[PDB]
Curated annotation (Swiss-Prot), chain A:
Protein name, UniProt field: Ubiquitin
Range within the parent protein: 2 to 49 of 128
Described purpose of this protein according to its UniProt entry: Exists either covalently attached to another protein, or free (unanchored). When covalently bound, it is conjugated to target proteins via an isopeptide bond either as a monomer (monoubiquitin), a polymer linked via different Lys residues of the ubiquitin (polyubiquitin chains) or a linear polymer linked via the initiator Met of the ubiquitin (linear polyubiquitin chains).
Record-annotated Ubiquitin-like domain positions: 1-48
Gene behind this protein: RPL40A
Effect of residue 47 to R: Deficiency in ubiquitin-protein conjugate formation
Species in which this protein is naturally found: Saccharomyces cerevisiae (strain ATCC 204508 / S288c) (Baker's yeast)
Compartments where found: Cytoplasm; Nucleus
UniProtKB/Swiss-Prot annotation, chain D:
Subunit and interaction comment: Component of the heterotrimeric CDC48-NPL4-UFD1 ATPase complex. The CDC48-NPL4-UFD1 ATPase complex interacts with the HRD1 ubiquitin ligase complex composed of the E3 ligase HRD1, its cofactors HRD3, USA1 and DER1, substrate recruiting factor YOS9 and CDC48-binding protein UBX2. Interaction between the complexes is mediated by interaction between CDC48-NPL4-UFD1 complex member CDC48 and HRD1 complex member UBX2. Forms a complex composed of CDC48, NPL4, UFD1, UFD2 and SHP1.
Subcellular location: Microsome; Endoplasmic reticulum; Cytoplasm
Protein name (database record): Cell division control protein 48
Its job: ATP-dependent chaperone which probably uses the energy provided by ATP hydrolysis to generate mechanical force to unfold substrate proteins, disassemble protein complexes, and disaggregate protein aggregates. By recruiting and promoting the degradation of ubiquitinated proteins, plays a role in the ubiquitin fusion degradation (UFD) pathway. Has a role in the endoplasmic reticulum-associated degradation (ERAD) pathway which mediates the cytoplasmic elimination of misfolded proteins exported from the ER.
Effect ascribed to mutating residue 249 to H: Restores cell growth
Positions that bind ATP 1: 48-54, 149, 185
Effect of residue 52 to A: Moderate reduction in growth rate
Superkingdom as given in the UniProt entry: Eukaryota
Numbered residues of crosslink Glycyl lysine isopeptide (Lys-Gly) (interchain with G-Cter in ubiquitin): 96, 113, 137, 296, 313, 368
Family: Belongs to the AAA ATPase family.
Consequence of substituting residue 52 to T: Probable loss of ATP binding. Complete loss of catalytic activity
Chain positions found as Phosphoserine: 246, 293
Amino acid sequence: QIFVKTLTGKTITLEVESSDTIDNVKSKIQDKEGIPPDQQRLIFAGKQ
Amino acid sequence: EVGYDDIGGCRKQMAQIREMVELPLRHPQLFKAIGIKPPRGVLMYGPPGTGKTLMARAVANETGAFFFLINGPEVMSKMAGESESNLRKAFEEAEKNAPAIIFIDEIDSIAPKRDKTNGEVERRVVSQLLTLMDGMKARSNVVVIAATNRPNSIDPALRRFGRFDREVDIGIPDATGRLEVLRIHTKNMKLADDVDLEALAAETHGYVGADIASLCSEAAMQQIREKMDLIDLDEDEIDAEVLDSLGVTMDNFRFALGNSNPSALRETVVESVNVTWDDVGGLDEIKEELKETVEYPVLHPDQYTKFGLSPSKGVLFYGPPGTGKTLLAKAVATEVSANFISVKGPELLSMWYGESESNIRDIFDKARAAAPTVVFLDELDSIAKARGGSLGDAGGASDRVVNQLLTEMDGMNAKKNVFVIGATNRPDQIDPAILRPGRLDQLIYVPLPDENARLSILNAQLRKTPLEPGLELTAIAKATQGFSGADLLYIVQRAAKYAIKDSIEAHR
Amino acid sequence: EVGYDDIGGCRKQMAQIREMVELPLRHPQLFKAIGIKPPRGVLMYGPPGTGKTLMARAVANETGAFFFLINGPEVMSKMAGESESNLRKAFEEAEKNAPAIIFIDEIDSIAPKRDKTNGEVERRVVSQLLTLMDGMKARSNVVVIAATNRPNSIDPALRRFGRFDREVDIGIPDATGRLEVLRIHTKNMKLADDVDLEALAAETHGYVGADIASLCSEAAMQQIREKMDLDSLGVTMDNFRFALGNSNPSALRETVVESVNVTWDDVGGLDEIKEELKETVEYPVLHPDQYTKFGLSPSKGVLFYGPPGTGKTLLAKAVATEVSANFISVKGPELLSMWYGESESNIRDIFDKARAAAPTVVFLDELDSIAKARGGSLGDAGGASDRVVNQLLTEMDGMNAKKNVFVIGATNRPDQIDPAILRPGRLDQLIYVPLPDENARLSILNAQLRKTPLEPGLELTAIAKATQGFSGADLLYIVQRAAKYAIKDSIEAHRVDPVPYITKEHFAEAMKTAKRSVSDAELRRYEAYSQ
Amino acid sequence: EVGYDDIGGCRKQMAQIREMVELPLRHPQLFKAIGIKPPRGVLMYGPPGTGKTLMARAVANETGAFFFLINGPEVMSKMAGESESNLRKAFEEAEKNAPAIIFIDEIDSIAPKRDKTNGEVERRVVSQLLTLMDGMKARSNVVVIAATNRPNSIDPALRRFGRFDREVDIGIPDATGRLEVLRIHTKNMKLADDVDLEALAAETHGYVGADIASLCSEAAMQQIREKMLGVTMDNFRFALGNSNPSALRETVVESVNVTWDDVGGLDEIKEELKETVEYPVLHPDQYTKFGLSPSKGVLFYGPPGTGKTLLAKAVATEVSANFISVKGPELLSMWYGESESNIRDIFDKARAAAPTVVFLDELDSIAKARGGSLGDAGGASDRVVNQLLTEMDGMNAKKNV
Ligand SMILES: Nc1ncnc2c1ncn2[C@@H]1O[C@H](COP(=O)(O)OP(=O)(O)O)[C@@H](O)[C@H]1O
Ligand SMILES: Nc1ncnc2c1ncn2[C@@H]1O[C@H](COP(=O)(O)OP(=O)(O)O)[C@@H](O)[C@H]1O
Ligand SMILES: Nc1ncnc2c1ncn2[C@@H]1O[C@H](COP(=O)(O)OP(=O)(O)O)[C@@H](O)[C@H]1O
Ligand SMILES: Nc1ncnc2c1ncn2[C@@H]1O[C@H](COP(=O)(O)OP(=O)(O)O)[C@@H](O)[C@H]1O
Ligand SMILES: Nc1ncnc2c1ncn2[C@@H]1O[C@H](COP(=O)(O)OP(=O)(O)O)[C@@H](O)[C@H]1O
Ligand SMILES: Nc1ncnc2c1ncn2[C@@H]1O[C@H](COP(=O)(O)OP(=O)(O)O)[C@@H](O)[C@H]1O
Ligand code: BEF
Ligand code: BEF
Ligand code: BEF
Ligand code: BEF
């Protein structure tokens, strides 16, 4: 004698986006980070 | 190019859209010294292809400016924040070549409501368009155009003061507007000297404009298919005397008028059962009373406007079962010029919470989009249930789905000549608020047929029969006293079943 | 490859799709000479198992144009804007080489109604499809077609003039619409000379596009199975009848019935009822041209309202295996639900599925619990129980086409049925099965056993003239009690009879415990009508 | 590993699934030049606990070909996409290197009916499952095999000829199909020969193969707990007690004492109940020799306190058939749709036992003869009496209930 319909809701999905690109890490691998307090880098020469 | 002449009808709404795209561009000194320029945004809503995607194509060729277009979800890509930037550089592209005109299409994916999205990038694109529309305030700017259906699903922050406050409705042409559609769409075609363009618009009453183009396409193909003489398949050129044009006749438009199928009721197509106003014989004063109350507001809509009175709509059928009253609704399926919508009782009832009241709200909107039409509600006892004494026996709010039908029959707006027909066998279990002249005017009662009525009942069913040498049918009428209309169908079916049995026994 | 000759059935629906994807491409000088530009593609729909997903294979070879395949959920990816960019990079791929055609298989997945969904990417992929078919200028010569099976769960803006012109319906084939179907599904196969393709098409009703293709596969598999005991083989219509036992249920798989049969000879006495029920289902099927010549619809509904025990609830078991029609069985209130919902849709999905497998014979048993509508709510009977009848009243006659659906009803109380169902068009043939008399009972006792040695020299006429006022299954109790005493005199130590020789001594004590089921007071309620 | 002998215990349904995938591979020259493609999709269904998860591993060793395997809901991951592409990764990997056998499991949870659910992922999982089974000249190498217990919950478009046809029914093995299960998982165990194994074939009847493996596992734990070596009957007879088949686990009855000696005097009534439930069980060949159906059960009526709740307790502990007790009007409920399926699954489990006996106490409460003639009580609940009316004889065939 009793009736109930339902309640709705439940399933949802999400999207994800990507990171920067190919050529930013191509340029991120070619730079400097700094001198921590005081160091040197390079002073050399070769083949006479 | 499409120009000014391609838009069919819509003259009361063309004059609104002309003054906001032409007069700031043609006369820029007119808006000076009278204050600032009011119109900078517009939104066209309604059915989607009634002349909203053509209006953007119209202003691209009759208003010379640096025009470009914005589609739907084409601004989305697999980057970080580029989705809010490429539409920013699209607006900046329109302003670096100022003066220009900008059109964005289908803002359902671009600008949805902020409460429906949940933590994704789509809630920032609607916020990006909200900032750049009103923050960009230079001199002689661009005017945005939105041509999108479903206007109630738009966030109300996009209508505050400056995003768009000049939204317009491209209305459905009901009378003498679809004639201006047919004058333009058949101008490029070379019609034969048989069609009547006023008769094609006066027979039907509810179209959408785009289906009028669907009417001429199927009428053009049926004339080619009738004149399809395929003898030379490799040479594939149909001349038969000379390089000529076949055209289209009046009979080809009558064939396309049969399978019209408008877009408002494409999901609510009825089974085309043939009727010719002669399947019912016993009803001679209630059938013509049914035809005059459904034709007079739709065939001659001038006398009701002259008197100033409301038209009559809404009729209920009640009586004993087996004598018409649902198969009379079969007679108005293909015969009347209004479209038919059939409901087989609780077929539109759903098991979800808000879906059962939403499946009854939109069929009436499909009856509202289709200009004047008739709907049919068979077995209203399954819908009404007298609105009294639930006490848990209703359970799933069976009296609350009735209250949705309370407000749709009388209507909060002006009535568009829709016709509701209810058919049932018991008038006592119907709620008495259904029986009021605001919704159902008269309650006609079909009686049991007498001897004069049931004689022409047997003449109605014996129409297409390979009859024997004839016998009198008045003797069968005086013997079958007090029977319904379906009871006499059983007698002619039993007599026909004996006519099949002896024919097989005669063979071998 | 497949061609247009390799696809049979809907020849009228074949030509309306051939003049649209081939005739504007092969014959382009008609549209520019007279008339408007040629319209766009159609939306194919219908029941599953028809050749909607094998019609598009024929236009991919013989047309010669560039074909691009786009499946339904194939254009889907977890990025934010590649679910619509992959869709638009394929339609512009077909624009590079005009003309070209695009088949959207299963369009129901990526095009629902936009008002039903909320907060997904699926409302974006349909709005991309809105501006892709008829955009601003991006439509020159490509024609895009689609195939599905649910046209109602599509947005109505997608079936406009710009996107989808006609809704072509590949429907259920009929006689000489399913005969050329079996001819092309048997062309390459090695067949014998005794096969008759015309007789196989008359006994296949629900067999539409693939069940009839299952019939040529299961009969060939049975021919392989018998050949396991280089060498040529061939079907000989013995495995075709063996494959005809279980090859129908594509749509009616949920309501299959198995496997009881009485082969029309286990019932007796009702000689007039057996012929009346036979010609009500064999006339619209075996001779359909006689009814269209006379121009009258046949009679369908029959109802049984006899007393309990005469043979009404398994007379439907007699027609379930004898006549060539689909059988749907409903055992009482087996379709009711509690959800304000599915209890009403269970009648709806059982009739159009039966109408799809036309012709068919449905069976509604014990309609006393189904047809309680005129009293409600009767205190504890429960309200909203008359809607289950009003849905049934709109399916028997309603507003529908005549699909030769035969309704058989069996009940024991004729006064508790809705009189709205008791009318012609729904239930016209009202037959009252009585108790068997002395004439019917002698044809009842021998037809019940049919498999037992009966001690030749006995007389069953003495039982028929005696035990008056007994039902048909009341005599089932006597022969079951006699077989009970027959094995009681045989389960002892056999070290007694090595033969099933039931004698009169087993029938002696069987008549002692034989009691009458139908009382005299309950008999008068059936004789009170006398109509 | 398992094989064709380890799966042995079904005969008619075994040869249908074996020649479907091995005969086109061991003998491919007979299909060629025959005009018909081989069948391409297996769908085996039945009651739970049968070997629909272990048939696929059994011919996933004996053919010697490229087996695979997909679980049910692990393919459903949260992306807008890849719930259909991980299905594509399982099919495009299985395309190359002919031949091909792929097994998909749990097709009742995933891929439901289209118009009966509301989830936007579920509209795309069903059709991607369709399109990879027939696309644009697809189905050239792969052979799909399904396994489920609810065939009515799957999509009606899924059981077509191109994707899932020649479906095989894996039912309850009792007519010398139960005895073949005993000889498989006992040849690996140590069995001291003191009894016969053929008497155990007719002791219980609702066993579905998986309950037989639980029967021999109960005797293994009973053997080691009394030696705190082989196996004996006393562990198996203790396993014969509290047997509890998986189809009848919801309704238990084995809690009463020893009977058949607590009653006396009504020996002609006690012998009559032995003549109606022990005769087809012990002697099934005598009924088919006469070619007649066996008799039905016994209805009790009389004075209160005579012993009619003890005669139900007498047959519950002595005869070999299963027992299901209904405690008065127990199955009656408040819901409208229920008390019709609640009286149905008891009879559905009764026909799945093959054979058994059910008991309905106080038939005044469950019959309520006719509500049409009943107006003073105001009940009018004729649904529960008519569904009971069509479940005993009804429309279906008899299975010795
Ligand atoms: N004035 C007009 N009356 C009727 N139909 C028109 C008119 N102008 C354009 N159409 C039709 O509209 C279609 C193109 O625009 P449409 O699809 O209606 O756009 P939208 O759906 O964006 O409103 C074509 O079928 C065209 O024939
Ligand atoms: N004189 C008649 N007038 C109308 N219908 C008739 C007549 N004679 C026979 N019929 C047929 O009898 C049937 C009666 O159905 P109908 O009265 O609509 O059903 P219901 O009893 O459910 O209201 C229809 O098929 C109708 O065409
Ligand atoms: N003309 C035809 N008549 C009947 N069956 C056909 C016909 N053409 C193809 N089929 C069958 O249809 C199936 C392939 O297409 P189908 O699965 O029906 O596609 P879809 O489900 O997409 O409509 C095969 O079983 C094939 O035998
Ligand atoms: N002479 C008989 N004719 C038909 N059925 C019979 C006969 N004797 C016994 N039976 C069996 O008795 C049962 C009762 O059949 P029927 O009268 O249709 O149902 P009910 O018992 O509900 O009245 C069926 O199983 C039927 O096969
Ligand atoms: N032929 C067989 N007879 C009886 N039981 C079997 C048979 N083959 C396997 N089993 C049992 O089935 C179980 C493994 O498969 P099962 O769990 O039944 O799979 P599913 O539930 O997927 O059908 C084990 O308990 C095993 O002993
Ligand atoms: N002579 C007897 N035979 C059977 N049961 C008996 C006897 N004396 C006492 N009892 C017990 O009395 C109870 C009543 O049994 P029964 O007559 O079946 O039920 P009820 O009391 O409802 O009539 C049971 O527990 C039964 O075991
Ligand atoms: F202009 Be439509 F909405 F594509
Ligand atoms: F279709 Be009628 F209202 F019985
Ligand atoms: F493969 Be079809 F669309 F059922
Ligand atoms: F028992 Be299921 F097939 F895993």
